[PDB]
Structure formats: structure tokens, C-alpha cells
Amino acid sequence: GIVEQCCTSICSLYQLENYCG
Amino acid sequence: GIVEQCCTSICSLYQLENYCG
Amino acid sequence: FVNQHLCGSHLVEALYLVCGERGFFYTPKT
Amino acid sequence: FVNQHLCGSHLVEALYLVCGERGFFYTPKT
Numbered sequence A, B: 001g002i003v004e005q006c007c008t009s010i011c012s013l014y015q016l017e018n019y020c021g
Numbered sequence C, D: 001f002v003n004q005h006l007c008g009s010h011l012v013e014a015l016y017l018v019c020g021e022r023g024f025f026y027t028p029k030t
């Protein structure tokens, strides 16, 4: 999920925006 | 929903546990 | 507005620790 | 998990800022 995506690699601001809703 | 509740007055961790998914 | 915006930062900070595995859905518009 | 638990704390802060009024959802799994 977000942890696997963004704790193993740097997520841009727009990649984090997917989890907003 | 919690902002009008736990920012108007302090909430213990037990009250915050209600907002857990 | 700013104070509750400042306060909301600590709430999600607190929800992360308390809930743990449960997780949560933070919704300010309610 | 200590590395990722610390990492998740900043994600919760990051999500709150970027999502804001829309809100967000944290699901610790996998």
C-alpha cells in the first residue's frame, strides 16, 4: 500500500494524493 | 468531525480510539 | 481556522499511535 | 517494523497536509 510504495521509495506529492479521496 | 470535538476540549486516548477504523 | 488546522495535525498524529494496525479515515468535513 | 512505523508517522503528517479538506485514509497492511 502507501507504506510499501512510499517507505521503500520517495513518493512525489501527486503519488501521495491518490490516498486522499 | 473530531476537530469540533477534540480541539474544543482535550480528548483522552480512549476517546480517540473511537475514531479508529 | 489556523489553530484548528494546527490542532488537526496533532490529532492525526495521535490517531496513528492509538489506532496502530486498525488505521483510520481522517475526515475534517463533518 | 520500527523503520516503517517511524516512516508511517511522517506519511500521516504528509497526507493530512496534502489532502486537507478532502481528508485521507491510512490503512497499515501488507
Ligand SMILES: [Cl-]
Residues within 6 Å of the ligand: C006, C007
Ligand atoms: Cl501547534
Ligand SMILES: [Cl-]
Residues within 6 Å of the ligand: D006, D007
Ligand atoms: Cl524518523
Ligand SMILES: [Zn+2]
Residues within 6 Å of the ligand: C006, C009, C010
Ligand atoms: Zn503544533
Ligand SMILES: [Zn+2]
Residues within 6 Å of the ligand: D006, D010
Ligand atoms: Zn522521524
